[PDB]
Design a protein around this nucleic acid. Structure first.
Ligand code: ZN
Length: 252
DNA sequence: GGTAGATCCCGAC
DNA sequence: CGGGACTAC
């Protein structure tokens, strides 16, 4: 799920778990647990804590408990569900939080790609994976000025820049390509080559693109198909080590 | 330090 | 091979 979907999960999941107390934590794929390193310590420490809140930073979910925070990333295919302990688990369920009321928060992931970190609340923001995370794209902290400053200092492409979690939080591959199209900027352009005008335009489209989604596609996955603005076939290449989609007429 | 690379996964070509 | 977010040049 992308940032907008994660925000939706945050909003919808909260009332389903707030105020519930953890009675057990069952782990069927220990590698998901990244901290504490020992999955048995992870499970042991959460038992007895009550869920108090649920926040989002980038694409990370931060479950707030009594003493600890659980930081969770779903990557591409991870999913949470709240359901009864009396029913069979769905396929590819890797971690289950059992509540004293007989309900469960279950983490599924066909790809087994997600991660979980638990720390005392007060430590979470200064430890991985939240440490170094850039500003929210929808916050005033993410500004043309901030973007311009990172752009001038690097030799990387503008796409590589936008994908950098330290530059801006949780801006995924799809929104990078879409924003660059809407801004009229080629993804392979050196970040430092962007004029002041292009930076302002890019920031504007990044906010608009992600903002609209939080509340169709022009290029992503549309290779070989006509651009919706000019009719030129959308092309796909590899930039910054990822599938990259663009219109060679609209973007310069 | 800045940056590319290696790392984890497995359904689907 | 597709993605997102510790190691070594
Ligand atoms: Zn076009």
């Amino acid at each position: 799920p992308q940032l907008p979907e994660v925000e939706t999960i945050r909003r919808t999941l909260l009332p389903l778990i707030v105020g519930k107390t953890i009675e057990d934590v069952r782990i069927f794929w220990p590698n998901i647990i990244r901290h504490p390193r020992d999955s048995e310590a992870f499970a042991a420490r959460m038992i007895g804590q009550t869920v108090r809140g649920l926040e989002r930073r980038g694409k990370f979910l931060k479950f707030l408990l009594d003493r600890d925070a659980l930081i969770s990333h779903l990557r591409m295919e991870g999913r949470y569900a709240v359901a009864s302990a009396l029913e069979p688990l769905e396929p590819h369920t890797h971690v289950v939080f059992c509540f004293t009321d007989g309900s469960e928060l279950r983490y599924r992931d066909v790809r087994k790609f997600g991660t979980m970190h638990v720390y005392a609340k007060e430590e979470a923001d200064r430890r991985p994976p939240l440490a170094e995370l850039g500003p929210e794209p929808l916050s005033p902290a993410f500004s043309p000025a901030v973007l311009a400053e990172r752009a001038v200092k690097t030799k990387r492409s503008v796409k590589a820049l936008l994908l950098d979690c330290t530059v801006v939080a949780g801006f995924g591959n799809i929104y990078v390509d879409e924003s660059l199209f809407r801004a009229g900027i080629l993804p392979g352009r050196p970040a430092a080559s962007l004029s002041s005008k292009e930076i302002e335009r890019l920031h504007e489209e990044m906010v608009a693109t992600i903002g609209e989604a939080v509340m169709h596609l022009y290029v992503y996955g549309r290779q070989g198909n006509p651009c919706k603005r000019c009719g030129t076939p959308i092309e796909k290449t590899v930039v910054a080590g990822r599938g990259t989609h663009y219109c060679p007429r609209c973007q310069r």
